[PDB]
Each structure stands twice: as structure tokens, then as C-alpha cells.
């Protein structure tokens, strides 16, 4: 069958770390006093959380509150684990506390305190020098929990909260994100559609952290090119049609030949014959401006379906893309 897949960074981390870091599943939780929060306002609602503004009122601070959907208890061990392991790491969301909600019965965290805005709600109006700022920023968040042996697993707008007044950026909802083991085969099931990689559209579940790097490439695309959402499927398999009539046929069938991976055949009265569109394809005189060489040649190195051959995290922020961007 498959032909395994190995990450070509940091494959060892877990390997090398004490159990107590990547067994989860045994994380003894350490519960503070839901008495020192007090909810404000529902900020919203998804399948597995509903997300409170909040004060913690031992210190009159503001914070946000994700009161945990019950789901299953390894991945609220799972998510609570991850988020201290990460604590502290550049553009990492801060788990300050963690407490019973008395009502729901289950794990409230508490986060520190981001501007209630997305980074959905203003990447579509982003100079050109914003857009490179906001990527190099995101990168660092990547390259960190890579570097800790994490994927998150569901890059997307709504998952990057930004204080644009600030220029700071914060990478949340760590819900889907698990600890990268060499060989583990993982669910396909996670990440948006959009910013889906093709490895999951495709069932290929020996996957790593260059999954995140596609999704963050699905967001460039429709940052520079201003098309919300810039692989637009209808479902999974179209999806993956999607990406097809962008990148062409060719390059799919060589990806799936070289893991040895068979497509559902469904996509066979689907997918047809697609040439690979060069990128200029995508420019007009409306997002002309965001558009560079670099921002081209860059995006080309992340949406690849190999996802093997994607630039890693790190090697993203060597690309002269970022030049420009001034480092502190
Ligand atoms: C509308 C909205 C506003 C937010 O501030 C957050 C979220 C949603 C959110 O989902 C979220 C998830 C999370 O894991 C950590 C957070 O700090 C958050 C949030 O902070
Ligand atoms: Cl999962
Ligand atoms: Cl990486």
C-alpha cells in the first residue's frame, strides 16, 4: 500500500523528550479557582467551545474565557498539554489559567487577554508591507511549535487573532493540534476545507508539520491576489479540483504515484486534465500592488502537493519575501 513519509525537520523531538511531554493522555491537570473569573460577553461559538470575554477579577484584567464542548477527554488533555508546552513561545496564545466552569461541568481556559479581532476581518485590506509583517510574524508561531514537535493542524484566519494598532499577533484554538511522532498515521479529518492540504484530500495519513505550511499558503494566496477564499471547492473532492485546475493534473498524479496512494474513484468523472496555470494568471490591476516576484516565487515554494518538497517554517523566513520586512 502507502509509501511512508518522514518530516524532513525536527522528526525527533518527541522521541527524545521525556514521556511527560508528549503522553497526554497521563497529564495530571492543575485547576485554579474558577471563582477569580467572571464572564462578560459570548464571543462565539464552534463545535467544540463557546469563547467568553472575561475579567479575572484578582487582578482587574481582561481575558478570554474558552469554556471545552465535551468531546472526548484526550483531546481536552490534549489541547490543555500542548498550550503549556508552547507557553511562551513567540505569537503563541498564553494559557494563564485553567478552572470547572460550574454550569457546563467541564475545563474552562483562561487565555490573556487579544483584541476580539481576526485576522479574516482585515487581511483583505493589508498594504503590501502588512501582508509580508503578518506572514513573518505567523511564521515565527509555526516554525516555534514545530520546533516543539507540534502541528496545529488548523491554520486559518480565524484562528490568528491580530491587534493591528499593536502590530502583535496571536495564533489560536491549538484544539486540533497534536505532537508530530515519526511513522504515525493521523486523522485526515482536521483543518477547514479551504486550507485543507491535498495530503488529507487525498487520505494520506502519514503526514507532519508541512501541512501547515499548505494552509499557510492557501492564506497568502488570498492575500495578494484578494480572493477569499483562493481554493474555493464546494466539498472535499471538489477541493481537491480546485487546487487541480490551479497547479495542474500532472503534478497530482506524480504526488500520489510517488506515495504510492490511490484517489477515491470518484474523481475520476471530476478531476479531468489540467495544465499548471502560471501565477501572473492571478494578478489584475486591483491587487497588482501586493504582487511581487518575491510574494511569487514564495507562494509557488508553499503550495506545493508534495509535502515533502513545501518550505519548511524556517526556510520561509530566509525567503527574500521578507527582505523588505524590518527584523528586531
Ligand atoms: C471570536 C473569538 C475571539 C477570541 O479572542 C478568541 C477566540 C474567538 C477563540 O476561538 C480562541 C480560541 C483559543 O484557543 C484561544 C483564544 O484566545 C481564543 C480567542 O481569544
Ligand atoms: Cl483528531
Ligand atoms: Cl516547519
Redesign the pocket.
Known sequence: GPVPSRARVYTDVNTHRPREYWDYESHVVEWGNQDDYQLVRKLGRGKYSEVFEAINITNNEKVVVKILKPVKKK?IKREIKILENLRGGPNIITLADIVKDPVSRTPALVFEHVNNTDFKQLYQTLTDYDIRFYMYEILKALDYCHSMGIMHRDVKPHNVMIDHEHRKLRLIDWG?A?FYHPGQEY?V??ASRYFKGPELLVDYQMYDYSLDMWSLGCMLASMIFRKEPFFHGHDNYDQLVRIAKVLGTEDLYDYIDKYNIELDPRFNDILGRHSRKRWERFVHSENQHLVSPEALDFLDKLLRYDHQSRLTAREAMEHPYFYTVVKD
Open positions: 483531546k486540533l497534536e486523522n479529518r482536521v
